[PDB]
Amino acid sequence: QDVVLGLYYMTRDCVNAKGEGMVLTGPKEAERLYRSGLASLHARVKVRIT
Amino acid sequence: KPLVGTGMERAVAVDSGVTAVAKRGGVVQYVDASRIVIKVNEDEMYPGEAGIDIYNLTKYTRSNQNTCINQMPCVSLGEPVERGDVLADGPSTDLGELAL
Amino acid sequence: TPEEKLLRAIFGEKASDVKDSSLRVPNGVSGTVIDVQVFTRDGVEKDKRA
Amino acid sequence: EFLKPRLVDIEQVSSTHAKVTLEPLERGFGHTLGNALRRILLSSMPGCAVTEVEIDGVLHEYSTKEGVQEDILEILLNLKGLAVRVQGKDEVILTLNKSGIGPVTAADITHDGDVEIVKPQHVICHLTDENASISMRIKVQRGRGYVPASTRIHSEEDERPIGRLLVDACYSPVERIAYNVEAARVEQRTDLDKLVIEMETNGTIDPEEAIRRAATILAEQLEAFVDLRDVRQPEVKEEKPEFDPILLRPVDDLELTVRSANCLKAEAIHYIGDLVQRTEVELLKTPNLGKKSLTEIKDVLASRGLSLGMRLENWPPAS
Amino acid sequence: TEFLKPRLVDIEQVSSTHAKVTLEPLERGFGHTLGNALRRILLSSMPGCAVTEVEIDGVLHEYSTKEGVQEDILEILLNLKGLAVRVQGKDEVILTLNKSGIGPVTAADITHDGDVEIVKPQHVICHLTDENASISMRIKVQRGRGYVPASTRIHLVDACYSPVERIAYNVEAARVEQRTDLDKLVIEMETNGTIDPEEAIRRAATILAEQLEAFVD
Amino acid sequence: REEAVVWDILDEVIREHPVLLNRAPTLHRLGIQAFEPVLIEGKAIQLHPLV
Amino acid sequence: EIKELLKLGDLPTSGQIRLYDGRTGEQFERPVTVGYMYMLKLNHLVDDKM
């Protein structure tokens, strides 16, 4: 229960937030992006993934 | 004591024997963590034998469930107590209120 | 028994005619003694402490 | 290629609480040092705190004093909160007396070169009978963080003074710490931040004193974070004791008479490894030891299995 | 009064670029405090040289097309941020991409300059299609004690200065003989290769320590 | 004596040595499950949340 | 009446505030409720059960 609210709130999106629309190399700098208060956890974004 | 209560706590505290309740209104002559002596007011006082109601407090002692049941004085030296006032709190009762 | 016998003899204990039955405190539980009572049979001589 | 901060106005506001400021702070280091200082300041700060207490005619916490309105248990609980400061000393034993129908404040104690009663209104208890009278040995150590009455018995080794009533020790002086980094514009430089660290004390630490020991520890820690030697311990301890291990125990263990007890104190014999190898020849020559006095030593040595006067070409090995 | 510094610390590193350090036993609460604080400095303020701006050869806009390349303009910016740059005496260098023909432009296919060191010549910059297909441009590296977005440049590439690609600290319970609960601190880091994980931290910490030079006694 | 030496031992004897945990109504086979023991201060059992 | 009494305290009506994690020092997204709830210890104390 706790844990699923967690993944959901994590992988969920809102309309407009910090980070809206930027582009990233891969998840590694996605976290670097968030931890440092630049991006909202849930913000619509194009990233390179493998 | 409950920050948030409903109002019975005062009712329960007294009616349950746990607390020590003033028999007759008067003033406190003596306060020891052990006992409480009340000099009765004249109005309530019987003519002969005069004096005072003396309440001896229960100190640290075993409960049925092995909890500890101990009375404490909640009034101060030379304070007015009216008939039916809280003279000392039991365990898990504060200032006349029920505090579980 | 034998080997028990030889042991009492090597370390010199006077193996008693009396067992140890003393009331001792229960494992793990620890506190302050706040009272002692002695209940004595009607007609037994009261000990020192009693 | 970097800057470095330092502390401007440390503004006291009460004996209990002050707001110290930190001005040369670069981007977000405001929160970097700010949280991490809250974390050292709320724990790792020294404090002296009342530890044990002997009281007059009182055996243990669960009793009542005759003519006082607190129950002993409570009275120890008033002392847990007895704020104090001492300087050169590391455990002082204050003393309290007073009689007469009178509220006994933390004042009514007796001063020492080192003792500062940072709050002498502090109520310790109340007397209630003209010639009701109390005395006590309040004992105050100084240490770090929370050392609860319970953990204090492992050394034991005879805390027999039954009238000694250990209280839990809340050794600290921080109450709550609360930083905020409001952006401070030093006249030129893009944006550097301020760090108003607000705090709340028991009175017994002076804010600047604190904040330094705080960085002190932060340093000492990181000190090994710099380099990283993969360091380890040698370990692999020894599985070979030579003699019987009894020879490493102290002579108290022999549960012997006082006169013979100090005799081996004085003739230099702590460990039974030395009492074993000292004959009767050695002992009449020893200060205050006769036929009654030594008959004593051959009976306990007899019952434990050992003897007087022997050898071991090897005593004692080897750490 | 007197404090606790750790013992036993096996930095068990996978590859040269990646590393996992375990380090016990810390005082209580000291895992997180040191862990988070070194994380902040490792992430946000760590001196590095990445790429900030690029002037193109063919077209004047970030929404245009180059003839001969399947990689979009936003795409190649991404490949750039992931190129690892380390400068020497030089505070800012700019390089020329001179290469053309039937296939991908690696970083050995970059101009080799004096105070320039490319940690990955293998690094794929872009692909080159058929025939000829022309490509040369000048790309200006910038210096900073951070990670600076394309957007933060108001008067264009996200500048990923700090060598740290990723940081985490995990705090778990460590037992010291007769102490119940101490912290055991596990730091795990990945780098852009320009500095090995083992040192990044030394200096990452060195920086933090430098700020306390105003307090210690 | 609860000598301090033993704890370093117990960790040995504990290690690869599963224990069984079982809760009140044993209903499906998953009512008993085996885990690898990790030493704890406190008189409580710590039970992994997914189970 | 509850909110009205929250005014006089000089406290938000949300009953919620912003809070910060003691560890990372950073803020918690969203307001969380904080308040005072009278709470009991029942005597199913662990060291009687173990």
Side-chain angles (χ1 to χ4, degrees), chain B residues 30-34 59-60 70 72-73 75 77, chain D residues 62 64-71 73 128:
Chain B
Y30 180 60
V31 187
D32 192 315
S34 309
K59 299 299 290 189
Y60 299 71
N70 184 39
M72 284 168 48
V75 303
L77 239 174
Chain D
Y62 305 92
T64 32
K65 221 294 156 65
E66 184 62 10
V68 338
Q69 100 163 304
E70 285 64 349
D71 350 21
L73 195 263
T128 190

mmCIF file with all atom_site columns, all heavy atoms in Angstrom, chain B residues 30-34 59-60 70 72-73 75 77, chain D residues 62 64-71 73 128:
data_model
loop_
_atom_site.group_PDB
_atom_site.id
_atom_site.type_symbol
_atom_site.label_atom_id
_atom_site.label_alt_id
_atom_site.label_comp_id
_atom_site.label_asym_id
_atom_site.label_entity_id
_atom_site.label_seq_id
_atom_site.pdbx_PDB_ins_code
_atom_site.Cartn_x
_atom_site.Cartn_y
_atom_site.Cartn_z
_atom_site.occupancy
_atom_site.B_iso_or_equiv
_atom_site.pdbx_formal_charge
_atom_site.auth_seq_id
_atom_site.auth_comp_id
_atom_site.auth_asym_id
_atom_site.auth_atom_id
_atom_site.pdbx_PDB_model_num
ATOM 1   N N   . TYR B 1 30  ? -2.871 20.655 56.441 1.00 0.00 ? 30  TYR B N   1
ATOM 2   C CA  . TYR B 1 30  ? -1.588 20.004 56.149 1.00 0.00 ? 30  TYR B CA  1
ATOM 3   C C   . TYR B 1 30  ? -1.533 19.216 54.821 1.00 0.00 ? 30  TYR B C   1
ATOM 4   O O   . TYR B 1 30  ? -2.478 18.491 54.485 1.00 0.00 ? 30  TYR B O   1
ATOM 5   C CB  . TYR B 1 30  ? -1.200 19.089 57.322 1.00 0.00 ? 30  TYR B CB  1
ATOM 6   C CG  . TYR B 1 30  ? 0.116  18.386 57.064 1.00 0.00 ? 30  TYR B CG  1
ATOM 7   C CD1 . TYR B 1 30  ? 1.276  19.118 56.859 1.00 0.00 ? 30  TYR B CD1 1
ATOM 8   C CD2 . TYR B 1 30  ? 0.209  16.996 57.019 1.00 0.00 ? 30  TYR B CD2 1
ATOM 9   C CE1 . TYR B 1 30  ? 2.484  18.500 56.612 1.00 0.00 ? 30  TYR B CE1 1
ATOM 10  C CE2 . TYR B 1 30  ? 1.436  16.357 56.768 1.00 0.00 ? 30  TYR B CE2 1
ATOM 11  C CZ  . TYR B 1 30  ? 2.573  17.125 56.553 1.00 0.00 ? 30  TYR B CZ  1
ATOM 12  O OH  . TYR B 1 30  ? 3.822  16.558 56.294 1.00 0.00 ? 30  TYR B OH  1
ATOM 13  N N   . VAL B 1 31  ? -0.445 19.390 54.059 1.00 0.00 ? 31  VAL B N   1
ATOM 14  C CA  . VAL B 1 31  ? -0.238 18.648 52.821 1.00 0.00 ? 31  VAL B CA  1
ATOM 15  C C   . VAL B 1 31  ? 1.122  17.955 52.729 1.00 0.00 ? 31  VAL B C   1
ATOM 16  O O   . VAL B 1 31  ? 2.166  18.563 52.656 1.00 0.00 ? 31  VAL B O   1
ATOM 17  C CB  . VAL B 1 31  ? -0.343 19.531 51.587 1.00 0.00 ? 31  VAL B CB  1
ATOM 18  C CG1 . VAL B 1 31  ? -0.284 18.650 50.352 1.00 0.00 ? 31  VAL B CG1 1
ATOM 19  C CG2 . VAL B 1 31  ? -1.615 20.313 51.586 1.00 0.00 ? 31  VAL B CG2 1
ATOM 20  N N   . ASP B 1 32  ? 1.068  16.649 52.685 1.00 0.00 ? 32  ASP B N   1
ATOM 21  C CA  . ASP B 1 32  ? 2.229  15.809 52.651 1.00 0.00 ? 32  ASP B CA  1
ATOM 22  C C   . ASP B 1 32  ? 1.942  14.928 51.480 1.00 0.00 ? 32  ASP B C   1
ATOM 23  O O   . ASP B 1 32  ? 0.776  14.666 51.215 1.00 0.00 ? 32  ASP B O   1
ATOM 24  C CB  . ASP B 1 32  ? 2.353  14.995 53.928 1.00 0.00 ? 32  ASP B CB  1
ATOM 25  C CG  . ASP B 1 32  ? 3.700  14.302 54.084 1.00 0.00 ? 32  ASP B CG  1
ATOM 26  O OD1 . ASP B 1 32  ? 4.173  13.710 53.072 1.00 0.00 ? 32  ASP B OD1 1
ATOM 27  O OD2 . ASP B 1 32  ? 4.250  14.294 55.216 1.00 0.00 ? 32  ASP B OD2 1
ATOM 28  N N   . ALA B 1 33  ? 2.959  14.442 50.780 1.00 0.00 ? 33  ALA B N   1
ATOM 29  C CA  . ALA B 1 33  ? 2.686  13.492 49.701 1.00 0.00 ? 33  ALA B CA  1
ATOM 30  C C   . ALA B 1 33  ? 2.000  12.238 50.276 1.00 0.00 ? 33  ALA B C   1
ATOM 31  O O   . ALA B 1 33  ? 1.440  11.429 49.548 1.00 0.00 ? 33  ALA B O   1
ATOM 32  C CB  . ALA B 1 33  ? 3.980  13.129 48.963 1.00 0.00 ? 33  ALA B CB  1
ATOM 33  N N   . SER B 1 34  ? 2.020  12.116 51.594 1.00 0.00 ? 34  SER B N   1
ATOM 34  C CA  . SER B 1 34  ? 1.390  11.007 52.299 1.00 0.00 ? 34  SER B CA  1
ATOM 35  C C   . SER B 1 34  ? -0.089 11.223 52.681 1.00 0.00 ? 34  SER B C   1
ATOM 36  O O   . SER B 1 34  ? -0.903 10.329 52.520 1.00 0.00 ? 34  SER B O   1
ATOM 37  C CB  . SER B 1 34  ? 2.214  10.666 53.533 1.00 0.00 ? 34  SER B CB  1
ATOM 38  O OG  . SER B 1 34  ? 3.562  10.510 53.144 1.00 0.00 ? 34  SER B OG  1
ATOM 39  N N   . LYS B 1 59  ? -0.147 5.020  48.647 1.00 0.00 ? 59  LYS B N   1
ATOM 40  C CA  . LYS B 1 59  ? 1.117  5.129  47.926 1.00 0.00 ? 59  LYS B CA  1
ATOM 41  C C   . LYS B 1 59  ? 1.625  3.822  47.289 1.00 0.00 ? 59  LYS B C   1
ATOM 42  O O   . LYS B 1 59  ? 1.130  2.741  47.602 1.00 0.00 ? 59  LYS B O   1
ATOM 43  C CB  . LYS B 1 59  ? 2.160  5.746  48.836 1.00 0.00 ? 59  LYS B CB  1
ATOM 44  C CG  . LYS B 1 59  ? 1.789  7.152  49.303 1.00 0.00 ? 59  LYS B CG  1
ATOM 45  C CD  . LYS B 1 59  ? 1.639  8.096  48.107 1.00 0.00 ? 59  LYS B CD  1
ATOM 46  C CE  . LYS B 1 59  ? 2.981  8.393  47.440 1.00 0.00 ? 59  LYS B CE  1
ATOM 47  N NZ  . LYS B 1 59  ? 2.921  9.468  46.412 1.00 0.00 ? 59  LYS B NZ  1
ATOM 48  N N   . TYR B 1 60  ? 2.660  3.958  46.446 1.00 0.00 ? 60  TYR B N   1
ATOM 49  C CA  . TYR B 1 60  ? 3.046  3.004  45.398 1.00 0.00 ? 60  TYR B CA  1
ATOM 50  C C   . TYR B 1 60  ? 2.705  1.577  45.742 1.00 0.00 ? 60  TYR B C   1
ATOM 51  O O   . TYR B 1 60  ? 3.201  0.993  46.688 1.00 0.00 ? 60  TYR B O   1
ATOM 52  C CB  . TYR B 1 60  ? 4.546  3.122  45.066 1.00 0.00 ? 60  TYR B CB  1
ATOM 53  C CG  . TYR B 1 60  ? 4.981  4.477  44.551 1.00 0.00 ? 60  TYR B CG  1
ATOM 54  C CD1 . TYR B 1 60  ? 5.037  5.580  45.380 1.00 0.00 ? 60  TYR B CD1 1
ATOM 55  C CD2 . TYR B 1 60  ? 5.311  4.661  43.226 1.00 0.00 ? 60  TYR B CD2 1
ATOM 56  C CE1 . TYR B 1 60  ? 5.425  6.829  44.914 1.00 0.00 ? 60  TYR B CE1 1
ATOM 57  C CE2 . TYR B 1 60  ? 5.699  5.915  42.740 1.00 0.00 ? 60  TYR B CE2 1
ATOM 58  C CZ  . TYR B 1 60  ? 5.750  6.992  43.595 1.00 0.00 ? 60  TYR B CZ  1
ATOM 59  O OH  . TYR B 1 60  ? 6.125  8.235  43.133 1.00 0.00 ? 60  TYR B OH  1
ATOM 60  N N   . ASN B 1 70  ? -1.022 4.886  42.384 1.00 0.00 ? 70  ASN B N   1
ATOM 61  C CA  . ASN B 1 70  ? -0.449 5.807  43.348 1.00 0.00 ? 70  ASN B CA  1
ATOM 62  C C   . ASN B 1 70  ? -1.156 7.148  43.362 1.00 0.00 ? 70  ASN B C   1
ATOM 63  O O   . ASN B 1 70  ? -1.335 7.735  42.318 1.00 0.00 ? 70  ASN B O   1
ATOM 64  C CB  . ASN B 1 70  ? 1.046  5.953  43.024 1.00 0.00 ? 70  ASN B CB  1
ATOM 65  C CG  . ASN B 1 70  ? 1.794  6.818  44.006 1.00 0.00 ? 70  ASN B CG  1
ATOM 66  O OD1 . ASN B 1 70  ? 1.545  6.757  45.210 1.00 0.00 ? 70  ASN B OD1 1
ATOM 67  N ND2 . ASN B 1 70  ? 2.732  7.607  43.509 1.00 0.00 ? 70  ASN B ND2 1
ATOM 68  N N   . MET B 1 72  ? -1.617 11.225 44.339 1.00 0.00 ? 72  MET B N   1
ATOM 69  C CA  . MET B 1 72  ? -0.850 12.456 44.542 1.00 0.00 ? 72  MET B CA  1
ATOM 70  C C   . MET B 1 72  ? -1.702 13.646 44.951 1.00 0.00 ? 72  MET B C   1
ATOM 71  O O   . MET B 1 72  ? -2.823 13.791 44.485 1.00 0.00 ? 72  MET B O   1
ATOM 72  C CB  . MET B 1 72  ? -0.082 12.834 43.282 1.00 0.00 ? 72  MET B CB  1
ATOM 73  C CG  . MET B 1 72  ? 1.145  12.013 43.043 1.00 0.00 ? 72  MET B CG  1
ATOM 74  S SD  . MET B 1 72  ? 1.724  12.317 41.376 1.00 0.00 ? 72  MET B SD  1
ATOM 75  C CE  . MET B 1 72  ? 1.693  14.126 41.277 1.00 0.00 ? 72  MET B CE  1
ATOM 76  N N   . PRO B 1 73  ? -1.161 14.535 45.795 1.00 0.00 ? 73  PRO B N   1
ATOM 77  C CA  . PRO B 1 73  ? -1.958 15.675 46.234 1.00 0.00 ? 73  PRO B CA  1
ATOM 78  C C   . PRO B 1 73  ? -2.090 16.721 45.141 1.00 0.00 ? 73  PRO B C   1
ATOM 79  O O   . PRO B 1 73  ? -1.066 17.125 44.602 1.00 0.00 ? 73  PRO B O   1
ATOM 80  C CB  . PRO B 1 73  ? -1.158 16.226 47.413 1.00 0.00 ? 73  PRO B CB  1
ATOM 81  C CG  . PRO B 1 73  ? -0.079 15.222 47.686 1.00 0.00 ? 73  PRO B CG  1
ATOM 82  C CD  . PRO B 1 73  ? 0.183  14.578 46.377 1.00 0.00 ? 73  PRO B CD  1
ATOM 83  N N   . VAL B 1 75  ? -3.845 19.643 45.652 1.00 0.00 ? 75  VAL B N   1
ATOM 84  C CA  . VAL B 1 75  ? -4.069 20.969 46.240 1.00 0.00 ? 75  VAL B CA  1
ATOM 85  C C   . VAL B 1 75  ? -2.863 21.452 47.004 1.00 0.00 ? 75  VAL B C   1
ATOM 86  O O   . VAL B 1 75  ? -1.993 20.679 47.420 1.00 0.00 ? 75  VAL B O   1
ATOM 87  C CB  . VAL B 1 75  ? -5.287 21.020 47.193 1.00 0.00 ? 75  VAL B CB  1
ATOM 88  C CG1 . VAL B 1 75  ? -6.563 20.581 46.474 1.00 0.00 ? 75  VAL B CG1 1
ATOM 89  C CG2 . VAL B 1 75  ? -5.036 20.199 48.426 1.00 0.00 ? 75  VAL B CG2 1
ATOM 90  N N   . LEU B 1 77  ? -0.956 24.102 49.977 1.00 0.00 ? 77  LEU B N   1
ATOM 91  C CA  . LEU B 1 77  ? -1.062 24.436 51.385 1.00 0.00 ? 77  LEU B CA  1
ATOM 92  C C   . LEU B 1 77  ? -1.924 25.651 51.685 1.00 0.00 ? 77  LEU B C   1
ATOM 93  O O   . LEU B 1 77  ? -1.707 26.721 51.136 1.00 0.00 ? 77  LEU B O   1
ATOM 94  C CB  . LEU B 1 77  ? 0.322  24.651 51.950 1.00 0.00 ? 77  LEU B CB  1
ATOM 95  C CG  . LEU B 1 77  ? 0.594  23.694 53.095 1.00 0.00 ? 77  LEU B CG  1
ATOM 96  C CD1 . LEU B 1 77  ? 2.029  23.841 53.532 1.00 0.00 ? 77  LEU B CD1 1
ATOM 97  C CD2 . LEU B 1 77  ? -0.359 23.961 54.250 1.00 0.00 ? 77  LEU B CD2 1
ATOM 98  N N   . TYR D 2 62  ? 10.551 4.876  45.132 1.00 0.00 ? 62  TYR D N   1
ATOM 99  C CA  . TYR D 2 62  ? 9.136  4.590  45.286 1.00 0.00 ? 62  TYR D CA  1
ATOM 100 C C   . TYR D 2 62  ? 8.639  4.857  46.664 1.00 0.00 ? 62  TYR D C   1
ATOM 101 O O   . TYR D 2 62  ? 7.767  4.166  47.132 1.00 0.00 ? 62  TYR D O   1
ATOM 102 C CB  . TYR D 2 62  ? 8.858  3.151  44.914 1.00 0.00 ? 62  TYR D CB  1
ATOM 103 C CG  . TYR D 2 62  ? 9.355  2.904  43.547 1.00 0.00 ? 62  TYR D CG  1
ATOM 104 C CD1 . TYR D 2 62  ? 10.637 2.426  43.327 1.00 0.00 ? 62  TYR D CD1 1
ATOM 105 C CD2 . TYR D 2 62  ? 8.580  3.231  42.460 1.00 0.00 ? 62  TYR D CD2 1
ATOM 106 C CE1 . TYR D 2 62  ? 11.108 2.239  42.066 1.00 0.00 ? 62  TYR D CE1 1
ATOM 107 C CE2 . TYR D 2 62  ? 9.042  3.043  41.191 1.00 0.00 ? 62  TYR D CE2 1
ATOM 108 C CZ  . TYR D 2 62  ? 10.305 2.545  41.000 1.00 0.00 ? 62  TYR D CZ  1
ATOM 109 O OH  . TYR D 2 62  ? 10.775 2.355  39.731 1.00 0.00 ? 62  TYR D OH  1
ATOM 110 N N   . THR D 2 64  ? 7.984  7.920  50.109 1.00 0.00 ? 64  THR D N   1
ATOM 111 C CA  . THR D 2 64  ? 7.675  9.309  50.406 1.00 0.00 ? 64  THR D CA  1
ATOM 112 C C   . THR D 2 64  ? 8.535  9.819  51.501 1.00 0.00 ? 64  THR D C   1
ATOM 113 O O   . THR D 2 64  ? 8.839  9.110  52.473 1.00 0.00 ? 64  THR D O   1
ATOM 114 C CB  . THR D 2 64  ? 6.272  9.518  50.868 1.00 0.00 ? 64  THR D CB  1
ATOM 115 O OG1 . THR D 2 64  ? 5.843  8.360  51.597 1.00 0.00 ? 64  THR D OG1 1
ATOM 116 C CG2 . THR D 2 64  ? 5.379  9.774  49.701 1.00 0.00 ? 64  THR D CG2 1
ATOM 117 N N   . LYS D 2 65  ? 8.897  11.082 51.371 1.00 0.00 ? 65  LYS D N   1
ATOM 118 C CA  . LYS D 2 65  ? 9.585  11.743 52.436 1.00 0.00 ? 65  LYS D CA  1
ATOM 119 C C   . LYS D 2 65  ? 8.531  12.259 53.366 1.00 0.00 ? 65  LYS D C   1
ATOM 120 O O   . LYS D 2 65  ? 7.444  12.663 52.947 1.00 0.00 ? 65  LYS D O   1
ATOM 121 C CB  . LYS D 2 65  ? 10.475 12.875 51.923 1.00 0.00 ? 65  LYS D CB  1
ATOM 122 C CG  . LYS D 2 65  ? 11.824 12.963 52.620 1.00 0.00 ? 65  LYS D CG  1
ATOM 123 C CD  . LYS D 2 65  ? 11.680 13.344 54.069 1.00 0.00 ? 65  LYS D CD  1
ATOM 124 C CE  . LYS D 2 65  ? 12.879 12.878 54.869 1.00 0.00 ? 65  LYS D CE  1
ATOM 125 N NZ  . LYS D 2 65  ? 14.109 13.595 54.432 1.00 0.00 ? 65  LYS D NZ  1
ATOM 126 N N   . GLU D 2 66  ? 8.846  12.194 54.643 1.00 0.00 ? 66  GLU D N   1
ATOM 127 C CA  . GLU D 2 66  ? 7.990  12.680 55.690 1.00 0.00 ? 66  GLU D CA  1
ATOM 128 C C   . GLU D 2 66  ? 7.981  14.201 55.642 1.00 0.00 ? 66  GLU D C   1
ATOM 129 O O   . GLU D 2 66  ? 9.010  14.822 55.724 1.00 0.00 ? 66  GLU D O   1
ATOM 130 C CB  . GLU D 2 66  ? 8.503  12.119 57.021 1.00 0.00 ? 66  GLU D CB  1
ATOM 131 C CG  . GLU D 2 66  ? 7.690  12.420 58.253 1.00 0.00 ? 66  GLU D CG  1
ATOM 132 C CD  . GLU D 2 66  ? 6.257  11.861 58.221 1.00 0.00 ? 66  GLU D CD  1
ATOM 133 O OE1 . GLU D 2 66  ? 5.890  11.059 57.317 1.00 0.00 ? 66  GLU D OE1 1
ATOM 134 O OE2 . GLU D 2 66  ? 5.492  12.245 59.133 1.00 0.00 ? 66  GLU D OE2 1
ATOM 135 N N   . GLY D 2 67  ? 6.819  14.801 55.447 1.00 0.00 ? 67  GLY D N   1
ATOM 136 C CA  . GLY D 2 67  ? 6.734  16.245 55.439 1.00 0.00 ? 67  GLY D CA  1
ATOM 137 C C   . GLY D 2 67  ? 7.124  16.961 54.155 1.00 0.00 ? 67  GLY D C   1
ATOM 138 O O   . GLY D 2 67  ? 7.329  18.175 54.170 1.00 0.00 ? 67  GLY D O   1
ATOM 139 N N   . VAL D 2 68  ? 7.251  16.243 53.039 1.00 0.00 ? 68  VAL D N   1
ATOM 140 C CA  . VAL D 2 68  ? 7.415  16.891 51.725 1.00 0.00 ? 68  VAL D CA  1
ATOM 141 C C   . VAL D 2 68  ? 6.274  16.457 50.803 1.00 0.00 ? 68  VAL D C   1
ATOM 142 O O   . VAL D 2 68  ? 5.703  15.375 50.981 1.00 0.00 ? 68  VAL D O   1
ATOM 143 C CB  . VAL D 2 68  ? 8.788  16.583 51.088 1.00 0.00 ? 68  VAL D CB  1
ATOM 144 C CG1 . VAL D 2 68  ? 9.759  16.179 52.152 1.00 0.00 ? 68  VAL D CG1 1
ATOM 145 C CG2 . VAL D 2 68  ? 8.690  15.501 50.050 1.00 0.00 ? 68  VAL D CG2 1
ATOM 146 N N   . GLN D 2 69  ? 5.909  17.275 49.821 1.00 0.00 ? 69  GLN D N   1
ATOM 147 C CA  . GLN D 2 69  ? 4.679  16.968 49.122 1.00 0.00 ? 69  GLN D CA  1
ATOM 148 C C   . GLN D 2 69  ? 4.949  16.289 47.778 1.00 0.00 ? 69  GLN D C   1
ATOM 149 O O   . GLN D 2 69  ? 4.050  15.758 47.144 1.00 0.00 ? 69  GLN D O   1
ATOM 150 C CB  . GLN D 2 69  ? 3.802  18.234 49.017 1.00 0.00 ? 69  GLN D CB  1
ATOM 151 C CG  . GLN D 2 69  ? 3.767  19.055 47.730 1.00 0.00 ? 69  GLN D CG  1
ATOM 152 C CD  . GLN D 2 69  ? 2.534  20.002 47.680 1.00 0.00 ? 69  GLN D CD  1
ATOM 153 O OE1 . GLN D 2 69  ? 1.392  19.561 47.803 1.00 0.00 ? 69  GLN D OE1 1
ATOM 154 N NE2 . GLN D 2 69  ? 2.776  21.296 47.505 1.00 0.00 ? 69  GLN D NE2 1
ATOM 155 N N   . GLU D 2 70  ? 6.207  16.226 47.383 1.00 0.00 ? 70  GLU D N   1
ATOM 156 C CA  . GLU D 2 70  ? 6.581  15.423 46.225 1.00 0.00 ? 70  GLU D CA  1
ATOM 157 C C   . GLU D 2 70  ? 6.899  14.008 46.631 1.00 0.00 ? 70  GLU D C   1
ATOM 158 O O   . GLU D 2 70  ? 7.306  13.748 47.737 1.00 0.00 ? 70  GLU D O   1
ATOM 159 C CB  . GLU D 2 70  ? 7.790  16.029 45.517 1.00 0.00 ? 70  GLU D CB  1
ATOM 160 C CG  . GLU D 2 70  ? 7.505  17.253 44.692 1.00 0.00 ? 70  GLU D CG  1
ATOM 161 C CD  . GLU D 2 70  ? 7.019  18.439 45.515 1.00 0.00 ? 70  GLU D CD  1
ATOM 162 O OE1 . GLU D 2 70  ? 6.705  18.273 46.718 1.00 0.00 ? 70  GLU D OE1 1
ATOM 163 O OE2 . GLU D 2 70  ? 6.954  19.552 44.944 1.00 0.00 ? 70  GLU D OE2 1
ATOM 164 N N   . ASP D 2 71  ? 6.733  13.073 45.722 1.00 0.00 ? 71  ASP D N   1
ATOM 165 C CA  . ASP D 2 71  ? 7.172  11.732 45.992 1.00 0.00 ? 71  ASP D CA  1
ATOM 166 C C   . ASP D 2 71  ? 8.516  11.618 45.390 1.00 0.00 ? 71  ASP D C   1
ATOM 167 O O   . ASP D 2 71  ? 8.757  12.137 44.315 1.00 0.00 ? 71  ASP D O   1
ATOM 168 C CB  . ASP D 2 71  ? 6.228  10.715 45.403 1.00 0.00 ? 71  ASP D CB  1
ATOM 169 C CG  . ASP D 2 71  ? 4.973  11.342 44.907 1.00 0.00 ? 71  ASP D CG  1
ATOM 170 O OD1 . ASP D 2 71  ? 5.004  12.567 44.659 1.00 0.00 ? 71  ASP D OD1 1
ATOM 171 O OD2 . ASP D 2 71  ? 3.966  10.615 44.786 1.00 0.00 ? 71  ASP D OD2 1
ATOM 172 N N   . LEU D 2 73  ? 10.197 9.808  43.646 1.00 0.00 ? 73  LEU D N   1
ATOM 173 C CA  . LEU D 2 73  ? 10.327 9.559  42.215 1.00 0.00 ? 73  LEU D CA  1
ATOM 174 C C   . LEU D 2 73  ? 10.222 10.907 41.507 1.00 0.00 ? 73  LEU D C   1
ATOM 175 O O   . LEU D 2 73  ? 11.015 11.216 40.617 1.00 0.00 ? 73  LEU D O   1
ATOM 176 C CB  . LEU D 2 73  ? 9.269  8.557  41.717 1.00 0.00 ? 73  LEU D CB  1
ATOM 177 C CG  . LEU D 2 73  ? 9.400  7.881  40.343 1.00 0.00 ? 73  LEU D CG  1
ATOM 178 C CD1 . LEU D 2 73  ? 8.577  8.622  39.352 1.00 0.00 ? 73  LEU D CD1 1
ATOM 179 C CD2 . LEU D 2 73  ? 10.835 7.784  39.844 1.00 0.00 ? 73  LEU D CD2 1
ATOM 180 N N   . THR D 2 128 ? 6.848  21.052 54.091 1.00 0.00 ? 128 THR D N   1
ATOM 181 C CA  . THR D 2 128 ? 5.514  21.377 54.507 1.00 0.00 ? 128 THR D CA  1
ATOM 182 C C   . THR D 2 128 ? 5.266  21.267 55.987 1.00 0.00 ? 128 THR D C   1
ATOM 183 O O   . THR D 2 128 ? 4.131  21.392 56.442 1.00 0.00 ? 128 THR D O   1
ATOM 184 C CB  . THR D 2 128 ? 4.523  20.490 53.813 1.00 0.00 ? 128 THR D CB  1
ATOM 185 O OG1 . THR D 2 128 ? 3.207  20.983 54.056 1.00 0.00 ? 128 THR D OG1 1
ATOM 186 C CG2 . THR D 2 128 ? 4.637  19.099 54.345 1.00 0.00 ? 128 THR D CG2 1
#
